[PDB]
Amino acid sequence: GMETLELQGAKLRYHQVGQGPVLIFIPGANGTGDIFLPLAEQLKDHFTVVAVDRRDYGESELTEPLPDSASNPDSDYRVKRDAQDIAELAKSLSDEPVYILGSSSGSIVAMHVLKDYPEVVKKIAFHEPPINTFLPDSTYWKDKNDDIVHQILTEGLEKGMKTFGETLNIAPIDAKMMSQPADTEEGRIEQYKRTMFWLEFEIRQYTHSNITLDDFTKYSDKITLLNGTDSRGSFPQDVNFYINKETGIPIVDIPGGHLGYIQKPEGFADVLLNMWG
Amino acid sequence: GMETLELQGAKLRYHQVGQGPVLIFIPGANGTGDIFLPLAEQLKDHFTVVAVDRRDYGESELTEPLPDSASNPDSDYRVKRDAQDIAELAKSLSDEPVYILGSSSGSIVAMHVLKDYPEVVKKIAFHEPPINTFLPDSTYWKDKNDDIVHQILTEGLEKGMKTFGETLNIAPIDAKMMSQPADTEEGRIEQYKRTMFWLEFEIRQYTHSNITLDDFTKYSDKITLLNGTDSRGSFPQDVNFYINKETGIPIVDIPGGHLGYIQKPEGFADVLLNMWG
Numbered sequence: 396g397m398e399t400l401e402l403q404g405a406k407l408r409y410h411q412v413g414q415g416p417v418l419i420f421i422p423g424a425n426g427t428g429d430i431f432l433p434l435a436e437q438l439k440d441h442f443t444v445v446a447v448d449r450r451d452y453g454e455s456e457l458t459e460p461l462p463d464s465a466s467n468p469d470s471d472y473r474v475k476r477d478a479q480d481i482a483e484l485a486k487s488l489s490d491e492p493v494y495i496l497g498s499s500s501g502s503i504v505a506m507h508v509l510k511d512y513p514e515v516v517k518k519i520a521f522h523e524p525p526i527n528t529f530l531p532d533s534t535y536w537k538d539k540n541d542d543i544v545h546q547i548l549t550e551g552l553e554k555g556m557k558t559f560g561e562t563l564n565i566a567p568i569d570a571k572m573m574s575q576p577a578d579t580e581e582g583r584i585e586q587y588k589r590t591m592f593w594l595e596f597e598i599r600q601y602t603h604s605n606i607t608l609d610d611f612t613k614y615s616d617k618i619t620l621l622n623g624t625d626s627r628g629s630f631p632q633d634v635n636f637y638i639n640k641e642t643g644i645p646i647v648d649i650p651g652g653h654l655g656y657i658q659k660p661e662g663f664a665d666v667l668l669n670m671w672g
Numbered sequence: 673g674m675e676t677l678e679l680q681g682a683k684l685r686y687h688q689v690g691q692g693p694v695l696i697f698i699p700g701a702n703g704t705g706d707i708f709l710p711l712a713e714q715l716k717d718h719f720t721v722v723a724v725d726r727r728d729y730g731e732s733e734l735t736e737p738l739p740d741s742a743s744n745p746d747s748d749y750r751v752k753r754d755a756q757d758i759a760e761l762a763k764s765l766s767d768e769p770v771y772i773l774g775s776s777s778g779s780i781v782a783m784h785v786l787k788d789y790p791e792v793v794k795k796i797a798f799h800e801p802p803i804n805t806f807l808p809d810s811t812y813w814k815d816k817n818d819d820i821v822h823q824i825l826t827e828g829l830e831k832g833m834k835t836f837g838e839t840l841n842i843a844p845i846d847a848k849m850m851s852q853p854a855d856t857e858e859g860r861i862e863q864y865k866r867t868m869f870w871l872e873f874e875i876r877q878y879t880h881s882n883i884t885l886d887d888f889t890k891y892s893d894k895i896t897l898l899n900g901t902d903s904r905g906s907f908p909q910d911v912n913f914y915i916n917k918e919t920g921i922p923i924v925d926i927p928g929g930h931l932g933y934i935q936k937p938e939g940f941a942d943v944l945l946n947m948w949g
């Protein structure tokens with residue numbers, strides 16, 4: 396139902412109503428053009444209104460993953476790519492310069508359209524821009540932005556991962572290993588990504604997944620439960636004790652803690668070789 | 673040097689060392705099989721050890737996006753797909769059923785391998801599983817996991833944004849609107865994901881991007897700055913006041929606040945028509 400312009404790295408989706416000169420609306424934080432549609436109706440008798448879903452939002456779709464560096468707070472990839480999207484969009488819709496309005500971060504995209512593709516711009520409006528780079532007090536506002544993101548993404552994550560470990564009674568040596576930062580900045584950003592992904596897409600879905608005790612009894616001859624010798628008292632050992640209680644499936648104790656296969660790989664292997672090998 | 677198995681929706685990468693019967697190791701929250709390589713070193717004379725990067729982690733890569741519903745906490749797409757990955761890997765490497773060990777969430781994957789693809793399992797070991805579904809106190813453990821994830825992915829965001837709105841003196845009209853929850857659970861999930869994306873990938877990058885007052889003055893004839901009439905005292909209006917003081921570029925007042933285009937679309941359109949119609 397939405398129009399599409401295929402660009403390098405994305406299919407850009409946009410609403411288009413009206414007749415007349417082109418007027419491109421660039422959204423802020425919500426990312427999507429639908430917030431402009433009530434406005435577009437008031438205007439459709441005077442402009443061909445184009446309301447964009449920026450490529451990372453809404454119905455637009457990336458055709459390749461974001462570059463890993465986009466996570467850096469001084470990355471310029473996305474803002475420049477958004478501006479180039481609007482310029483390519485204007486060129487595809489019009490042989491003349493067009494009207495552009497951006498709001499909030501969308502007004503920042505519009506600033507970059509004017510800077511890098513002024514030939515597509517007839518008139519432009521910046522609705523309540525939050526850019527701080529050229530301000531006398533730029534550093535104050537930049538630091539506030541940096542600190543709020545740090546608070547939410549990193550502080551919120553470290554405090555909740557500590558809460559997980561205490562909720563499950565994880566042994567210190569396990570807690571430490573599992574929350575240990577990566578020795579490189581690229582490793583640390585990956586480690587953040589991978590943890591957020593686990594929190595959002597794995598922990599809840601897997602720990603309440605569809606497994607019953609009957610699934611264990613049907614194949615009890617195949618199964619060994621393993622409890623670490625250095626992780627006693629933790630919730631995962633209680634899960635195994637329950638399985639054992641209800642099914643008779645054996646528990647074999649194995650060196651190390653929750654991470655004993657890396658903590659004590661010699662001792663872990665010996666148990667497995669005796670079990671199976 | 674990693675091996676590859678091309679499956680539906682992903683290229684599954686794994687380490688393969690040793691010789692004899694296949695023994696697949698399924699990692700937990702770290703997602704990657706390198707954590708088993710010291711253990712593999714100790715096992716490689718008795719087993720062909722296979723240590724998997726689950727498809728969402730490490731050197732594995734998706735070739736199709738995840739389903740939108742994977743974010744839902746009762747989704748079971750990912751655990752079932754992980755389990756299917758292990759099963760196809762076993763059939764690719766061995767004509768005999770194989771040995772399997774998983775730890776932590778990897779042990780839950782192993783559980784679904786036994787449930788759905790028992791034919792590929794010779795023997796299987798569940799090292800310290802944190803699954804709670806079949807426990808007599810499942811509700812306690814399930815609701816604790818749900819609370820902690822919610823805290824991080826949504827509430828730490830909600831609290832940080834309120835302090836951020838006070839720092840920028842965002843008008844109550846706009847704060848209420850920007851933080852109004854969606855009328856659907858899945859709609860609220862998408863809201864939070866969108867805001868978390870903006871937080872990580874947009875606010876810092878865009879607000880400290882490379883725009884100077886010189887970029888404006890080159891084209892002062894094209895530009896209108898817009899301030900809402902219901903968002904007085906907010907930081908984005910201070911940015912427009914600075915640009916106007918330094919360059920003379922006009923500010924035009926327009927109905928509504930920071931989201932004035934959806935708050936008062938008729939009055940917003942009236943001003944834009946005065947400007948460009």
Ligand SMILES: [Mg+2]
Binds near residue numbers: 403
């Ligand atoms: Mg190309």
Ligand SMILES: [Mg+2]
Binds near residue numbers: 822826
């Ligand atoms: Mg909530």
Ligand SMILES: [Mg+2]
Binds near residue numbers: 880
């Ligand atoms: Mg920069």
Ligand SMILES: [Mg+2]
Binds near residue numbers: 841905906907910
């Ligand atoms: Mg002020």
Ligand SMILES: [Mg+2]
Binds near residue numbers: 942945946
């Ligand atoms: Mg008029």
Ligand SMILES: [Mg+2]
Binds near residue numbers: 946947948949
């Ligand atoms: Mg005019």
